[model samples]
Target: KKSELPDPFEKARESKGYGEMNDQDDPVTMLLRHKDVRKSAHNYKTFQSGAVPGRIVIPSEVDIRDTRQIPFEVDPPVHGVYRAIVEPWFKRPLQAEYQEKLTAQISEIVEETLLKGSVEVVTDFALRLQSRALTLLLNTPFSESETWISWGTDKANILYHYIDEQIDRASENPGDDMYSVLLNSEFEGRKLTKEEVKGVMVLTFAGGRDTVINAVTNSIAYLAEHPEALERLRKEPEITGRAVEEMIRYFSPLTQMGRVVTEDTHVCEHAVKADSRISLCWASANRDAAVFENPNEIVLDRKVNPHVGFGFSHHNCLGATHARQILKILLQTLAQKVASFEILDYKENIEDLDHFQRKVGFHNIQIKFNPL
Candidate 1:
């Protein structure tokens, strides 16, 4: 049960189809059920992501960031245009070359950890994997990950400055990288400014990193606790992909994403006045029993999975392909290379949402790898 992430939304979700959160004086109406979560996410007009820069985020980056993350924070029509420019590059993981690169990277890391016998997964394993995997995502120099790995320790304007520097460098010297490509691509009638590129770059780095890191770390902890699941993977390698989705459904790396109310509307039949916020609480929706059997369990190879772990509708995760490749490669590599993992010691990173206490991942967890 150590790896079990408790579903705090179950009763609230079942009884009310919604949960409540009061974030810094501004409250949120959290949509917990699957149908409502999907419907609200799809209905962008009533619930808009186009709100003032960061107001669409809970705990409100509203004061923290002034830059608008392209496509993610933008609404449709124009959002679709921006997405088209960047979506193809994010899809590169589908290429055989990308898969081979990810496989090689994941296999090497698993072997390295096994050689060490023990590791603190969040920092030592997940962080390194996420940083290295990002190089593939950005099409940037592999050496850049060393800089990225070191900076995981900061929250204040650190990512902002780093993304800006990267944008400046790309504008000055073009390459095959995402920064260069965004610089090269025209939005309306002209090439994008470094400012605009920063918006996209920040979204790329800030959006994907921690979520992927958490997803990786949580999956490792889950496999460590449930060795039978590892054996299942080892005996039937074909289930690895399904296992990836199930794990993501269980983990829901990102709990909820907020969108501002564009008009007075009722979600799940509850009123949300204009300017208030409502969240597509993915964690809750994924565990809604109406949409899943044994909703809390990791049922690998679930055939009719309609889980929205990647989010729903037009604002679905842009990095889904890249994230899936990392986890799928990770699941496959662990099955082939590891016999079992021993949980030595750990501290869980629990999200203390006003009404819900949910464990998103580990702050740190020490694990010993036994050889296959």
Candidate 2:
């Protein structure tokens, strides 16, 4: 369950300034405190994302991927330019039309699941909802989601293949979409090249998919366990925004993010060498009792929440705005419709860090859904 998050790092967080985690030969010094997480993220120069392509990712995508995710791995000057080109597109979540379209997508899924009586939540319900809604964010045809649903959690891999295909297709014929926008977008006073377009496309696809699905699936379990929260949303709809923020803070779907150290630095007193890796553990930081009051409990109306759930500063998750909108719509739909959920059988997704075993989500969340 969402509430059974064991604080394995509590001793490490309180005793030492940081924790040690071995991730794919690139050992990381995990910053556990809230202040440390934010401070490290903000100090972009010292701990840079603009390092070798995928060095920042844990397990190091360096071997599998060569494409540098535009704006994601680039530093301020160049990052700013690419971000400007994609910013408006990412903000589509804010539009009434986009929200309406998203609402319909969410509503349809909720209604269908309600009719089905009981469903395996991880796949049958959450996956479908996430896929359907992604179409609206992509501004692609709704039918495109069928392909997305079929591919499953392998959307990133699928996207990698699709991107390579689309690049070839664009070489033959191209018009408008995110691909075309990035292709036609000018960078450094010159037209963007194919590699640049692929960089942005890789960022768009890989960045949002699994992370959003994890958030959606985890929220369903959270709401199921805390039915009163669901009732509260129904009675007081205005709290939906705060509730969404609180959920992200609590679940913190993506646990931690890594950054490459350009020079020797100390985070939380742990000395990290130049060229070594250090991770900002959002999961640990979000629950820092030093920063958040009752950090372990869900405070839906937690204002002044500077949680790094979507990350912090320069390299923050670009899909955050769209993601928040999805959560808000999902919460609103749940409040009006879902009565309760039954966790029939399940296995917690325990992430194996070097010393800490964190329960991030579920491996198999089989549940029965009942609508009001």
Candidate 3:
């Protein structure tokens, strides 16, 4: 059986080119078509991202805190500079040391699951893999992962507090960790402030949390459902990279991101007022039949995939390089070491947009990992 995600935006996308969402008091016009999503993402001036700290986030994280996610919550020139300062560190996934460490972590997790026979894919497998991978990404010791694994979905407040302490720790004892690196970096002739460093830290943790876990957990489930796909990944190294993006395309980890409209604009001939919100709907765009041939199916070796799963244009995801490496290594490991997976049970996690309903991932999925 092929695991499928229903296309919730198809009717709206085909008829009006947009969908609707009401988060808190603000209403959002969600651009659904592939063309509109890319165009909106590229035209940053009309769809500005530099709003107050949490104002632009879906479900609106506005009331929670004031720490702006650096680069992500800022616009160009400034965005360009901030990304330049941090890009090298984020790009460390390309290094042999980083990849080797990540491989070890993935292999250990896979082997543990294979031994246990039955495992909860979300918490026990995906979340653990992501937490340990973060240690490598942050240049922190492996032991630090236990603290993150404990924070599961206690999310922001816990991560916020942890970053505050780490910032102070970095100040007193400058080490090779991410906090020290951010503290040591220069921004506009001065060192980056603790708040700014915290902003980046928040993005680093939250950006990949559920999004990455969803990818990993879903990959296991999908591989279990479709043995041919897993076999293809194991047999062909050339297509493994392509398969990584295809899984991302099919899963679409982060659905959409918000932008504030600076001026009145017309997308797909629909009027959008100034000062309102519009999200570039990546999930809908990735499945647009105009771009992808078999829009819904997971074609493991998708060739011409221009999927915006990691986003698009100037404000593209900063950690995508690391994210891809995580997925690629993960698929390789599962294919080589595991025979199959049996879904003992699963509860779907759905997001109700008030109009369109989409399944993000599983709230919990119990899987039996059969060894090869």
Can you tell me which runs of candidate 3 are displaced by over 4 Å? none
lDDT of 2 by residue, 189-291 (tens): 8888888878887877777777787788888877778888888899999988888988888888888888889998676656789999988899989888888
Off by over 4 Å in 2: 1-3, 154-158
* Cand. 1 Cα-lDDT: 0.88
Please give the ranking of all candidate structures by TM-score, highest first, separated by commas: 3, 1, 2
Q: How far out, in Å, is residue 34 in model 3?
A: 0.9
Q: Name the lDDT of candidate 3.
A: 0.89
Q: Write out the backbone clash pairs for model 3.
A: none
How does candidate 1 fare on TM-score?
0.98
The best candidate by lDDT is 3
lDDT: worst 10-residue window of model 1: 151-160
Per-residue lDDT for 92 in model 2?
76
Could you report the Cα RMSD, in angstroms, for every candidate shown? Answer: 1.2, 1.8, 1.2
lDDT of 1 by residue, 1-372 (tens): 888999988889888888888987789999999999998899998988888888887778877889888988899988898898889988999999888988888888988998899999999999999999989888888899999899863374888987888888887888899999999998887898887788888888878887999999889888988888899998998888888889889899899999989888787778889988898999999998988999989897787688899998998888999999999889888888889888999999989888899899899999998997
- Against the correct fold, how does model 2 do in TM-score? 0.95
Where's the lowest-lDDT run of ten residues in candidate 3? 151-160
